[PDB]
Protein: 5'(3')-DEOXYRIBONUCLEOTIDASE
Amino acid sequence: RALRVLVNMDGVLADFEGGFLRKFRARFPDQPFIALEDRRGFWVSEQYGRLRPGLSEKAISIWESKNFFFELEPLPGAVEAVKEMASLQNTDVFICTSPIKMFKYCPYEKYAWVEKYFGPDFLEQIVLTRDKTVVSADLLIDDRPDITGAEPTPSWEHVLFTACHNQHLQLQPPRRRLHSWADDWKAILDSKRP
Amino acid sequence: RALRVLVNMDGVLADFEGGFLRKFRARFPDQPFIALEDRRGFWVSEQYGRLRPGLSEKAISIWESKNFFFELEPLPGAVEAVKEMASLQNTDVFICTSPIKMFKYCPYEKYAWVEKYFGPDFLEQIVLTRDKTVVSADLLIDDRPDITGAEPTPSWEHVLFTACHNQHLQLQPPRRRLHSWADDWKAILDSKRP
Ligand SMILES: *OP(*)([O])(=O)O[C][C]1O[C](N2[C]=C([C])C(=O)[N]C2=O)[C][C]1N=[N+]=[N-]
Ligand SMILES: *OP(*)([O])(=O)O[C][C]1O[C](N2[C]=C([C])C(=O)[N]C2=O)[C][C]1N=[N+]=[N-]
Ligand SMILES: [Mg+2]
Ligand SMILES: [Mg+2]
Ligand SMILES: [Mg+2]
Ligand SMILES: [Mg+2]
Structure:
């Protein structure tokens, strides 16, 4: 009866693409890289793997490093928008994020990042899961085009959040985008209310 | 269409109650303690708080310490039962656990513990969340008597897993218990299948 909205973290709240590129270039200044305008497909490591053998493993080593997740910059408007959204009447917001395989730093730093930008009281709103389809909600705002898992008919509508890797993608109607946090996210939420 | 079962971690897979008591007694050998047969109510810290002022904070310091979660022993039969359950046809198992407030070690060690006892491939089955009601499934096996959150009508049936703190509790019918992993968990699952 409160509208429930799942908001993804990497590529929606946290600038994974830009943080990765900067750190990759700083660590591997003699390697070729992929400019953001040229990113295609969800998996960074796969595109880097195509660019030259060995580069996939080098890419992976950036996000496996300590402080990678913690030092991500918020995307413009993201912190303000989610704080406003959570404050709305009849609206519950959860941050729904999928950790990487190597778990030494990533879960911890994701909690630390949410504490930093949203405060201790928001920590209760975090859901860490590899499968978003088993999380029930009205909406999922997420930059990954294809979201699948154990539940063949998730309860949420997936609204595709624009990112460099999906900006050229034609979606199957009636699939819907949120173009950035400057875009009219309130209209999207309202479209789902009784 | 596959049956989905959420299995709680602390007090269902991992022996939180026994690990806590042992470590509390080792660290604070001059303090009064609560024998397991005398545990009542979900919150350890609250019962310890009643036993004497200051003891709540001492209790908390045990599970906030590094290696507390990682060093928990599995409950008897738990690892074998969950491995068998996951291997069943038309049956998906997720481990659904709620981290403590202090997040330095707990998320990380929970992943490390699941890797230790269930293997790397099981890490994909973990859901960390403070709110279990937003996780959709057929069953939730969990030792906490009262499970509430943002979803007033969760999709799962909650089957109460016996623990020292709930063993005397009379439940409102048609609520159901799993008494230990030696008990007939297959019968409970089968009762929910088409
Ligand atoms: O779907 P979600 O929650 O945004 O992110 C999942 C997770 O994928 C990891 N990743 C990302 C890329 C681009 C890649 O090539 N390889 C990966 O393993 C990082 C991302 N966030 N985290 N943790
Ligand atoms: O409900 P769940 O997933 O088993 O555990 C929640 C979480 O509560 C923490 N806890 C437990 C007691 C008994 C207490 O007094 N105070 C707490 O903060 C530990 C438990 N597991 N974890 N992380
Ligand atoms: Mg994302
Ligand atoms: Mg609200
Ligand atoms: Mg429990
Ligand atoms: Mg199975």
Notes: Chain A has two domains: 1-15+71-194, 16-70. Chain A touches chain B through 31 residues (CB under 8 Å). Residues 70 and 109 of chain A are 5 Å apart (CA to CA). The longest helix of chain A spans residues 106-118.
